[PDB]
Design a protein around this ligand. Structure first.
Ligand SMILES: CN1CCC[C@@H](NC(=O)Cn2nc(C(C)(C)O)n3c(cc4sc(Cl)cc43)c2=O)C1
Ligand SMILES: Nc1ncnc2c1ncn2[C@@H]1O[C@H](COP(=O)(O)OP(=O)(O)O)[C@@H](O)[C@H]1O
Length: 486
């Protein structure tokens, strides 16, 4: 009662803005059964009439899972959301939770609290008044399998981080406490098996009117905001891709540098690889290109998303270099840890590690592909996708001229043999799907490669769900023509 006041005051200041104001927050399109009012998420809006205790938010990389979870904490602490339903909302940031370290649910709850000695026994008195907000399930570093056990039913017993979170998700630990898990659809395969009567909600990103809203929030000058949005409107691809809020931020940040220069506002970008290479080349006034890539490849191959001072100092990134990338919105920072500005940037530098000119992790693309779609290595969706785009010889920049074209050709051969094995195999059943291979060929864009690869698919068997799916598939199909077509 009196401690809840202190906790809400703490939550109000800790979730004040996007990093570490919430005026740049633009509404997200949330749809259920995967017009959703957040207050009604836990209501039994069915004939069940028994409250919903598990709510799953499935959203792709950069769609706004963390931003929605942070807005949730702030709105709740401000008496605007669930004022009547929950006494405490605990924010569990999955990228900080060790899956090996032995900790109890009490120790985890106390981790979310401001003071060293919180009234843990008083908090746990009414478990139904607690909402556990697990943000980024897919960011749990290491393996997470449904065979772990025994399951824990004591909030005070210290268990392995995987047993602990597994017992909380399965609703064995505080059975009637509420849960809000945000995950990428890829990890929804691991998750589904633990879930107890969950309510599924899909984060779809920005509406065509919310992309315009974002651009106008980003640029204070209305003349700049309208010129930036008109560029997107002119470019079919950038308009389509700007449904992902992270794409809206990357695009806006890139046009700011171009605006400061005085160059006629233009962005020809046709792929995610083109956008990522455009944003990165705008930062360049690179010297630590080997260091940045090895850090990301090591962080993907050895499951490190947060890097302390020692992790950066061994990769050649001294005090000044870290402070330059933090200022250039390449790195992020009261945790004494540093990470990439996003997970998709760590995957861009991991893909780039395999193509760098020589002048610690394994650069064998064969072993990288062997771990594709595996939870342990983070699924490697964007590593492989960016790898397809960067290998395209009919594309260059000052950044790409620093990549070895000899190993880029060898890797181009192995990516064709990978498509050939995936497509000409009925027994696959898991990632990559046919649509996912279509996204890879879309990053390639080169017609000699795309046409050779599309001749491996016997029949087109895909499920379209977005206008991005239509664009990608449309491109691959129009480059799939039978040899004797006359
Ligand atoms: C696992 N597969 C199965 C087949 C269908 C796949 N659909 C997509 O990937 C659709 N899509 N498209 C992109 C683009 C094309 C911009 O790269 N992005 C998405 C999130 C982010 S964050 C970011 Cl940077 C780019 C990006 C997104 O969801 C998912
Ligand atoms: N609703 C939103 N309004 C404004 N910006 C947003 C919103 N959602 C996401 N973003 C932008 O996307 C970036 C990454 O989003 P985030 O939620 O961290 O991604 P993920 O879905 O991987 O958790 C943020 O830093 C921000 O710039």
């Amino acid at each position: 009662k009196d401690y809840r006041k202190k906790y809400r005051k703490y939550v109000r200041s800790r979730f004040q803005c996007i990093e570490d104001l919430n005026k740049r927050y633009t509404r997200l399109r949330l749809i259920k059964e995967h017009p959703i009012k957040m207050e009604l998420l836990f209501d039994p809006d069915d004939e069940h009439s028994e409250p919903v205790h598990t709510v799953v938010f499935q959203g792709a990389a950069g769609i706004g899972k963390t931003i929605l979870a942070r807005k949730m904490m702030l709105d709740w602490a401000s008496g605007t959301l669930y004022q009547d339903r929950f006494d405490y909302l605990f924010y569990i940031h999955c990228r900080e939770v060790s899956l090996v370290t032995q900790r109890s649910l009490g120790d985890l709850i106390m981790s979310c609290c401001p003071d060293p000695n919180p009234p843990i026994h008083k908090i746990v008195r009414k478990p139904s008044r607690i909402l556990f907000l697990m943000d980024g399930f897919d960011e749990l570093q290491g393996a997470f399998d449904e065979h772990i056990g025994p399951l824990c039913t004591d909030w005070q017993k210290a268990e392995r981080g995987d047993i602990l979170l597994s017992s909380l998700i399965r609703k064995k630990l505080l059975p009637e406490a509420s849960l809000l898990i945000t995950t990428r659809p890829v990890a929804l395969e691991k998750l589904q098996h633990l879930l107890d009567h969950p309510r599924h909600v899909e984060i779809l990103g920005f509406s065509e009117a919310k992309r315009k809203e974002y651009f106008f929030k980003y640029f204070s000058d209305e003349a700049q905001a309208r010129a930036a949005f008109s560029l997107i409107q002119e470019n079919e691809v950038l308009f389509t891709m700007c449904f992902i809020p992270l794409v809206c931020w990357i695009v806006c940040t890139g046009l700011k540098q171009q605006m400061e220069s005085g160059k006629s506002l233009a962005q020809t970008s046709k792929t995610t690889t083109a956008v990522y290479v455009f944003f990165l080349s705008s930062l360049l006034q690179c010297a630590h290109l080997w260091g940045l890539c090895s850090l990301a490849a090591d962080g993907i191959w050895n499951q490190k998303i947060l890097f302390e001072e020692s992790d950066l100092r061994n990769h050649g990134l001294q005090k000044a270099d870290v402070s330059a990338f933090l200022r250039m919105n390449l790195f992020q920072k009261c945790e004494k840890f540093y990470s990439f500005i996003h997970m998709t940037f760590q995957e861009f530098f991991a893909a780039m590690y395999y193509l760098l000119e020589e002048e610690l992790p394994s650069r064998d693309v064969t072993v990288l592909l062997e771990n594709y779609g595996k939870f342990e290595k983070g699924y490697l969706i964007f590593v492989v996708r960016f790898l397809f785009g960067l290998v395209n010889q009919e594309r260059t920049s000052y950044l790409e001229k620093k990549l070895s074209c000899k190993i880029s050709q060898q890797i181009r051969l192995e990516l064709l043999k990978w498509i050939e094995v995936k497509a000409k195999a009925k027994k696959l059943q898991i990632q990559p799907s046919q649509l996912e291979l279509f996204y890879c060929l879309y990053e390639m864009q080169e017609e000699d490669f795309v046409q050779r690869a599309m001749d491996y698919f016997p029949k087109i068997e895909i499920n379209l769900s977005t206008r991005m799916d239509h664009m990608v598939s449309s491109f691959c199909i129009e480059n799939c023509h039978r040899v004797e077509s006359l």
